[PDB]
Amino acid sequence: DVVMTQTPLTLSVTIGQPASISCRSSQSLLYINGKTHLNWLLQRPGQSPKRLIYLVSKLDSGVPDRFSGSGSGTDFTLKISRVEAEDLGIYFCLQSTHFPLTFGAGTKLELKRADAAPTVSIFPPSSEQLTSGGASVVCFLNNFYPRDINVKWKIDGSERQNGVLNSWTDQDSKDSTYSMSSTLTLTKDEYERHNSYTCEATHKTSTSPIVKSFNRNEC
């Protein structure tokens, strides 16, 4: 089998700046007619893959010219002249010269933008969940950057680590930010035992936290 080795696995770039992805194969991909069946694909968040380049350097329909591909022997390179929002996702090289068809591991193309503080919203449990006998406090840390960020939860002034789960979205096409959701799972009894609920977003010690709170008790 042909092995496609991609580099790097993840590449972080500023808008407008060039990008260079490499894919190297374990054998020649020259076909019996002398054409080289090297394909490049982009898979954008939530979508299925789409081929961008075929035959080393030929672009698929209505693929912008910022994209180009070059190949010398067993080494093959995708280049983006200037990276734009739309470019974000996972890039795969694909040989279709020899069977089976084989893929590189994929390269994650990330955007570098200016640091940005989260928009924090805290949400008490809904009255339906309380009727159900459960209780979850949800916090959204929205449109921040970089991806690295921490959530502190405090109940009646004590830090709480148990029963917290965090989910990150993929990088946002529109503005290059990340968003994150933190869920604090409790029992009804426990939620009813306490009153002050606090969600904090910090990236580093030396940056003021963004804090959002409520009191179960008052409206």
Binding site: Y54, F99, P100, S121, F123, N142, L165, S167, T169
Partner: protein, 219 residues
């Protein structure tokens, strides 16, 4: 226009067989070879086999030979893939990928998500999340929706039947104790809500669940 429609997501027990379909339109069905691909954990890609629908002749990747069987029904323009001897290792997204050799164009389906497990299907509870009781007249308002305790994947969450698309963050689901939990936030202008009804729409195919939670001001 070339269109592929793949069978919906499934949860199947280990040791069984599964037949997936891929109904094609917008081109002469027999003119394009039909490839099948597997993607594992939303990254790693493998090519399974290809069929030539004209004569039904298939070529397999040795890794999957005996595991996968490709067929077509010319009459219905539909391609099929059978997977037998299922294990959790087979949990993946499966793509049909027709390749037009005359023109050299390739297209990808939206895939079919397979979950191999003995876990039983559990319908999610859906809870609307309204902002805190308090009177922060911020420029914007964020609402949320919590979808908890379901199995298997996937779930479709939309706001106002998908007509509300800007300012949405739907978070990847997380698994704890055999059940998935997911959240989505929506941010609109202060003018919009509460004066316009906003509804969380959640579908969980496997359980035939379809619920509309209206987000409403609390307490």
């Amino acid at each position: 226009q070339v269109q592929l429609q793949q069978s919906g997501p499934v949860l199947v027990k280990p040791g069984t067989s599964l037949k997936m379909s891929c109904k094609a339109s917008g081109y002469t069905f027999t003119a394009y070879y039909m490839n099948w691909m597997k993607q594992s954990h939303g990254k790693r890609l493998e090519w399974i086999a290809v069929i030539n629908p004209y004569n039904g002749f298939t070529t397999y990747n040795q890794k999957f030979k005996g595991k996968a069987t490709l067929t077509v029904d010319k009459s219905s323009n539909t391609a099929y893939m059978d997977l037998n001897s299922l294990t959790s290792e087979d949990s993946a997204v499966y793509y049909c990928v027709p390749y037009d050799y005359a023109a050299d164009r390739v297209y990808w389906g939206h895939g079919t998500l397979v979950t191999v497990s003995t876990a039983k299907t559990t319908a999610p509870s859906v809870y609307p999340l309204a902002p805190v009781c308090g009177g922060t007249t911020g420029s914007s308002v964020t609402l949320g929706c919590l979808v908890k305790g379901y199995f298997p994947e996937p779930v479709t969450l939309t706001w106002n039947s998908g007509s509300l698309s800007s300012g949405v963050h739907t978070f990847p689901a997380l698994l704890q104790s055999g059940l998935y939990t997911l959240s989505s936030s929506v941010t609109v202008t202060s003018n919009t809500w509460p004066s316009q009804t906003i509804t969380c729409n959640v579908a969980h195919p496997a359980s035939s669940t379809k619920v509309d939670k209206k987000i409403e001001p609390r307490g």
